[model samples]
Target: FKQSIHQLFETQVERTPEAVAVLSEQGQLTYEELNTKANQLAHYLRTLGVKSETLVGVCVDRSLEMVIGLLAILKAGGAYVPLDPTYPRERLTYMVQDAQISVLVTQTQWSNLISDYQGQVICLDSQWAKIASYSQENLVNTVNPENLAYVIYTSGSTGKPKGVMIEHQSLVNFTKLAIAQYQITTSDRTLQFVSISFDVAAEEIYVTLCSGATLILRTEEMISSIPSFVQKSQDWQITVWSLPTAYWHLLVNELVKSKIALPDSLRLVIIGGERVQPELVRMWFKNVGNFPELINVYGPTEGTIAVSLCRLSQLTESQRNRTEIPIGKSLGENISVYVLDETLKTVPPETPGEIYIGGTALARGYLNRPELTAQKFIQDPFSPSERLYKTGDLGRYLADGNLEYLGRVDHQVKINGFRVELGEIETVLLQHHQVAQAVVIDRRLVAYLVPHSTEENLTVTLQQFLKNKLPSYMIPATFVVL
Candidate 1:
């Protein structure tokens, strides 16, 4: 019943101090150990003059120390702005200056990257042993749920970066709803496959920890290793696995070829952050038999992780004949979705329109970009007092309450417009029976496809295959063999 995400973690740690809380390459840390380390870091931060609302830059690898740094920022009543060390120095410099970060937490390897920044650089390795022994009184209770938790900078289509500021309450609400919907329990082991930079990591960490479940952080190598990573993690008793549809498609194909048995412990496979194809789901079920709870999640970082969830029960013959599946209904409590026309008026069911989301889980606004924030986050027409986020996604409610995603209202476009979205068309084209990995791009009315295989002319074959299912307008007109 905590009002904030930090409180939820605090309450859980207090309740089960001996439980394994986080598992990473460094080592697994018990709730008590993690809590203690966070407290020590908090004390050190405070000693360095960090205060409420202070933006602390966090640039670190996926490690236990990164988790500690996040918790410590919360304990110090300050928001942490994450800057991936792997990003180019120019980008890092822009973020550091934009957020006006007063302090930065990073390892020694990245210390040189921030040498020009006129801020304190707190080295994780150098201060770890010192903070572990530092004594300080508790500083967690001072933070309010309304205080900013983190500032996530998303790459803008316009080439500029926009920071989305999220509050602790939004994180708490998202975690509660996700846990309730998924029936996540203490016995559940949730895999953290997404990078910390992505907003999905919020759900992976908070939901697992708040529900007293173990969080298994995967290495970059493990994630890139594909089917092998999925097979190896089966031993960890993972109950829930969340990854982009692109990876799922690859893993599904590998599962079919290798004839790998599905893990009995896996109850749910959540895919989001991209469209998922119906073909992938069909292949998954065909190979695995009674499939795990396959869920199609949809949401933007602006809405805190997810606003809708669609469970794949049974795909109709007609749906199987199509390329894309439906994006399910709203799952979180107090959340509202509106499919609106050009004037922002609600469109009739079965009519395509832009999607708008409103609820407690919405981010406060884009960080320090009032004009841009005002443009996207507007007054909810349905409820005059409420605000809704214009998702810029074209969708419509079907007869059965499921949403059919059409395309992006902006430059962002999904490949094949499938619900298991392909992250790499090159990889997909390579796996094709007749062709190598193909590159595809949708521009206005036509899709351009480039095939890697020389022997098979995919243009005619693909055109005929698509022509049978899709309307003339939906089929790609241009194809070039590479």
Candidate 2:
């Protein structure tokens, strides 16, 4: 069995060299062409001291080069840290320093954004001449299944970016299950919709590529317009789409309100990153029917992209009519799901408790934070010599054995499919010299602050300050002084 992600992709490349591997409005590449380019770039990365477990920063917009850069990094036995090019400079700087990356892959346009990065920067577009000079043959294997595949940084309650280190084995196992569960094939064209900085991108990229399916990259324009997105999905013959639950709700709303038709070529739709509204499911079934198979997935980054999924299309009438939809059973082998009480004992069915995930899908834990790692990834008491990720989510098993997601047990909330720590916002608010105390409410992100001085335009000043330090989604919607 193939263990590493790149090995599985390489096998697919050999099987269908002429098949279209990736597609964007800008350009496209066949499997052979993609493999050759990635191999040459991988060889170049090796000369820059990239090897097994080396963290390399990737800060480029979505394009053919983005896919090549990611594949080449893995081929060179390095773990990639995706740096969103649109992120604030302060946030990007913190990620680069936290990951301690020695090499970076980017485009010429964004090269000046990370000027503070004192490392080797390879511009795939401008430096193509130099990178292409390297050998096109795959290098010797130095990476093992247990080696770090990528480190995705998530919001931290301590007001810092927390990096979750996922090993190659965890990622490979997830891809294997995803391909089978989704029934992906060479004829399927999956949409690359998620941000590379997020862990879910691994599912959208590796799962489709490993199955020898073509990937259609979504553009910024497509993301903003629902009509255009649906139109493009039909035009591109996108058979599979993995989307955030909230965005799916908006799409359904637009379709129902505007009476727009669902894409003809879309066959399967997977939604996750938050709770699935039962009303939305019913509305979709009422309008779209069962033609496009819908599946609701649930998991934290610590347990890879997803651990359990519920096929909404296959639900019984009674199950479908329930107030809350189930998140379904575990997806991969060697995985165990538990709903435990505060004392760590299993709770009975229908009793709300903390969700714990164990087995091969478990991540290596937080990067450079041994204390936090030990606190969360605890020893599995039910299984000897095994560890389990203590997910802070609240869930309960249904009467039919499927898991039902309740909500968060802490202050963490999902904002537009991205996890946010409420405390983190409060911490950032307090950073301003004028702000004496700060508290942020959940969901809406309304900040109530006690100002040190009654200054003019303090709210505007704080917003501008936060724009430099945090992502746009993390900023408070409204600010009030107490």
Candidate 3:
């Protein structure tokens, strides 16, 4: 068993050298060809001061170069932070500056957007000559299980970005577990729709590559339009799909509403990152039939993508009446899930408690915040020298030892699959001189505020002000000022 993600990928490359490794609308690459390209870029990156545990910025488009960019970064012994090209400039600048990125992998057109970036820019398209001149041999191993593979930022309290630091071992374990569970093979082609910034996309990337399957990258617009996604899935013959629960529901809605037929090529569908509704699953079963095996996955970013798995079939007629579906047990070995009370005592079956997870698949911790890391990822009470991530999610163990997700114990809500801290928005609201008091109603993001004095454009002013500080998802939908 390899402790690094790159090692596992390399093994697959040797086994399926001529097989299609990655396919994008722009182009495609065989396993051997992809490795050679990555090796050349990796050698160049190493010469540019890439080191173990180093952070690299990737600001390219959703093309073949994106896949090669990430692979080359891992091969060069550095963790790549995904910078979405469509994000606002303020948000992009904040992420690049916060991570203290020294090198960026991007295209010539996008390079000028980050003009303030005080780092070396490797333009894959315009500077292919320099990149191709490097050696086509793999670099010496500088990364290990303990080193960081990627740093994904999530919403945090007090209006700040919380970067989740995942180690190589955690990424490797997740890939192996997913491959074994999905029974992925060379014949399978997964639809890579999720953005790389999210932890779920990491599963899609590694599970497809490490399992010797073809990786089919999806464009942002295709993912946004369900009709386009359905057509593309049919065209690509996607056999394995791992999508966000909300997006899956939207796809189902579009198919049922538009009276369109679903493709039967999908053998497995895994949905996660938010609550999965029973009605949505039932609707899918009614429309799509029992061709593809449906799975409801659950876990936090601290747990390295996902920790538990359950099938949609588990919800019988009796189970359908219940509110939230079960999250089931761990996918494989090297992890333990527990439902405990405030005192860390195990709760009886059907008793709701905070979910705590411990084992080899655990994330290292948050980046650049040791105090917050120590507070959330604490020492496991039952085991010595081991730690468990204290997930704020509320869940109860069923008689079958499966977990039933209750709801969030905090005001933190996931609006459109993005985690949003209501307090963060409240803080931003109070920062304005006119706002005396502010409160977020719920996940719907209804803001109730007490203003010092009502101004003609206070609402419009706040909206414009927040647009600069936070993402669109974090902004409240309806503002109530008194």
Candidate 4:
């Protein structure tokens, strides 16, 4: 079926209209109730000129309204660009300007955050009366699988973040595959743990919705504490969950140290963004015993949410003991993984080469970056018609055909599950007038500067400067002056 993301969700809503679709600390929404609200908001958005492929910015927190805003954007035939409310003003403004959003949907509290934004703003709290005047029935479907679904920005080496454009077809493919792999059903309650800015949030949200599962929205308190996460998982009866590798590392450590048991309701645990340590796998198997399926998913934002996944619980003893965990095989039939040398020729097994991802899972490429898109998403010589994403990641295929992670081919690093370009941080540092030269290193971001003046407390000054310019994850943990 060539169903768009919203259409697929609509199918589930039709099948189980009375089932609980979303659950948060504040409240819960039934499928019919959620659909009706989204329809009304979708109608309102259309009047604001949100049509197919029109970029709409969403700057709401993790709540029922966040899901409604996203769904309404899809229903209004617009692409949702998540603008995290917690992001620095400068960074958020850059994204808003770069994306050229037609309309921004946010709550009353966050309206001031983007008051400078030139687009029309819809505050869900105060504007509900106006939105309620619109029709509650679903709008005519003008969206196709080829239309843009979302535009998520990733850390770029060019001193700014670049938006990666994902079409509805790619999102639909991921949702279908994820639903089947996770075995989510109406009885299941999947945890929505990730922030909306990340593509993993789409995976958690859409996959659960398409499968007719209840989406449990995790609070910030639960995310910061492992004990709270476990307690809430039990309370909400979370069945399927997804998390970043770094956060999962902390959870595993807490579980092993405290001898705490994961909620028996949890069946699948998917982790990605960074490389998974083999020790985490051993700890899970040895301590947690093997009820919940622990999977290590891998994919760049350009290659969709997750193209490859490793089932750690199913790995053999020899595979588990390896230095790096295998990223495993492609997740769906439409996806392909290739290890190619400099000449773009397939490398022999056990030989290191760049990983090239092809097929339906590949994104439409970087938004408004024609040169970068053409450079990265190149023609596949093996299949003349299909395009391949040249992932700058280095990997080698195991004898079993699973791809092993061999780190990045460049200076890019994944700090706290956020892909960061050291060059970008360095560029931001060099922008400072006080600094003559700046260098950023990975493994816990460290910025070394050769300032023009021997200024006192340059570290604090640089820290404050970087805080305004970059995301918290991209900020250097320590600053050193030469």
Model 1 CA deviation exceeding 4 Å by range: 136-138, 314-322, 413-482
Residue-by-residue lDDT tens digits, candidate 1, 1-482: 44657678888988888999999766999888887888888888888877777889999888888888888888888888888766556567878888889799888988766547888888888877777776544565656777888888875443346689998888777888899988888898989876667788888888888888998888877766656586757767778898777778888877888877666788888888777777877877667755577888888889888898877645565755556687778876588776889887887788999999888868999977888899989987768998989988889998778887777855545433222112232333344566544544565234344444444556667766544323233345666654
Q: lDDT of each model, Cα atoms only?
A: 0.75, 0.90, 0.85, 0.89
How are the candidates ranked when ordered by lDDT, highest leading?
Answer: 2, 4, 3, 1
Candidate 4 lDDT, tens digit per residue, 242-358?
A: 989998989999999998889979988989989887888788889886679889898889988999988888988888998999899998889988899997899789999999998
Model 4 local distance difference test score: 0.89
lDDT string, candidate 3, 1-482, tens digits: 54678888888998989999999887899999888899899999998999888899998887788888999999988998988776667777888888889999999878666648888899998988889898987666768778988888887787777789888988888889888877899999998877787888888888999999999998767786788888888888889888888888897888899987666687888898888877887788778776688888888888988899987755576665567788888977788788999988888888999999989778899888899899999897777689988888899998877789888878878888887889888988898888999998674788889998888787788888888778888888788988
TM-score of 3: 0.96
The TM-score of predicted model 2 comes to: 0.98
Worst 10 residues of 4 by lDDT: 110-119
Candidate 3: misplaced stretches above 4 Å?
A: none
Specify the highest-lDDT model's number.
Answer: 2
**Candidate 1 vs 3: which has more lDDT:** 3
